[PDB]
């Protein structure tokens, strides 16, 4: 075993080719389940294999425990890789928890990825 740190965890990790569900998760460090660190950050996760937002959350909480971290979903929604018109967009909510703070997610995607623009809405489900 080795310690981990929140810098090692990718800040956004999405698989995108259409509409898919996504979740915004706060992650807390707990390196080797006992190192003197308890910092936190938010991360954006979204993969089209998930039937529901809970499947993403379950995977991610599993992986973080292998790293030396723990998780709490803040909310979620959907992302759409345009494949038709202009740019990545983010919308909807998760029935499981609530709407993500999509503004955090879009700024994170915009910082991490070289795509020119990212926007969000809360227009409907």
Could you describe the 3D structure shown?
- By secondary structure, this protein is an alpha/beta fold.
- The protein has a single domain, classed as Pyruvoyl-Dependent Histidine Decarboxylase, Chain B (3-Layer(bba) Sandwich).
- Helices cover 21% and strands 32% of the residues.
- It has a six-stranded mixed beta sheet, with helices on one face.
- Helix 2 links the parallel strand 5 and strand 6 (118-120).
- It is classed as hydrolase.
- Keywords: alpha/beta architecture, hydrolase.
Counting DSSP E segments of at least 2 residues, the number of strands comes to 6
Number of helices: 2
Going by CATH, the homologous superfamily would be Janus/Ocnus
Can you list the strand order of the major beta sheet? 1-3-2-4-5-6
Architecture, according to CATH? 3-Layer(bba) Sandwich
Q: Which word captures the global form?
A: globular
Radius of gyration based on Cα positions = 15 Å
Beta-strand percentage range = 25-35%
* CATH class (first level) name: Alpha Beta
Described by its quaternary structure, the protein is: monomer
N-C termini distance: 43 Å
The percentage helix is: 10-25%
Q: Tell me the number of structural domains.
A: 1
Do you know the CATH topology?
Pyruvoyl-Dependent Histidine Decarboxylase, Chain B
Order of helices and strands: EEEHEEHE
Main sheet record: 6 strands, mixed
User: What class would the helix/strand composition place it in?
Assistant: alpha/beta
